[PDB]
Amino acid sequence: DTIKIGAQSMTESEIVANMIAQLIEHDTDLNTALVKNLGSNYVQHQAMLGGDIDISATRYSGTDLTSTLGKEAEKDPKKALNIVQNEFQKRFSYKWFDSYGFDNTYAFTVTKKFAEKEHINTVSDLKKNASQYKLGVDNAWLKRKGDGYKGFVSTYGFEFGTTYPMQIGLVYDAVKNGKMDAVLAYSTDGRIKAYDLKILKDDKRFFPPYDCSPVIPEKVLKEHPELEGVINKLIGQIDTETMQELNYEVDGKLKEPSVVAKEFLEKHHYFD
Ligand SMILES: C[N+](C)(C)C[C@@H](O)CC(=O)O
């Protein structure tokens, strides 16, 4: 009886996956295995449907609402979460838990020099010379329905000069070093504050909310009745500002996700 915890290929997914793994083994006689390097929410969900994972560490409400459930991008945090919770329960008997306490949203990120020099505050301010710009984005966002590029173009009414898809990890330096004029960063990445970068305002509210939660089949929670109490320790416990520091511990200071998670868990006494 080994619990299989899925980690997406994001620093944040890996930290949180370890944090779950360690809290389980501390509180239980259940032992754990991490399934690393799932490329996306789709990969994660597919893996859960086939029994390959028992717990998703990091799922985001807007992402699964638009892709896995095939729904419109609901723009309200609370409403988005409810539809996602009721749909997972109703559709797969999966439990989409309440969030850890943090939203990890797509954010248009620029250097401050660039925003001074181009008079930029908002995503709409980009429109003026948009075709002059190089945008850095992740390997999937351009192909996404609902919350992807196509949606952005029909919402903000403009497109960028060129778009470059890369690994999300690398957009923080590419924007900093001038290789890109703007990137679509993730808001919880600690390098944004660490590089004194500017988040632009989503003035048209194109993006749905992206509250982060764990997901486990009830089938699993039935079997291991002591498991839900463990996950519950972490519910509402990590705000965006905490997640930003944790992320940076791996990203800036180059620590193993397991070390970061253990240090976090030690600091809060494993929450009893
Ligand atoms: C992190 N974000 C919420 C913006 C999206 C992402 O996780 C996409 C996915 O899981 O494929």
From Swiss-Prot:
Q: Where in the cell is the protein located?
A: Cell membrane
Q: Which Gene3D superfamilies match?
A: Osmoprotection protein (prox), domain 2, Periplasmic binding protein-like II
GO CC terms: ATP-binding cassette (ABC) transporter complex
UniProtKB keywords = Amino-acid transport, Cell membrane, Lipoprotein, Membrane, Palmitate, Signal, Transport
The record gives the membrane topology as: Lipid-anchor
Please give the chief subcellular localization of this protein: membrane
**Induction data:** Repressed by OpcR.
The Gene Ontology terms for molecular function here are: transmembrane transporter activity
Could you state one GO biological process linked to this protein? Answer: amino acid transport
Q: Which Pfam families does the UniProt record give? A: OpuAC
Query: Where on the tree of life does the source sit, at the highest rank?
Result: Bacteria
Task: Please explain the role this protein plays, according to its UniProt record.
Answer: Member of a high affinity multicomponent binding-protein-dependent transport system for glycine betaine, carnitine, and choline.
Quaternary structure, from the entry: The complex is composed of two ATP-binding proteins (OpuCA), two transmembrane proteins (OpuCB and OpuCD) and a solute-binding protein (OpuCC).
Q: Which PANTHER family match?
A: ALIPHATIC SULFONATES-BINDING PROTEIN-RELATED, CHOLINE-BINDING PROTEIN
Q: Which family does it belong to?
A: Belongs to the OsmX family.
Under which name does UniProt file this protein?
Answer: Glycine betaine/carnitine/choline-binding protein OpuCC
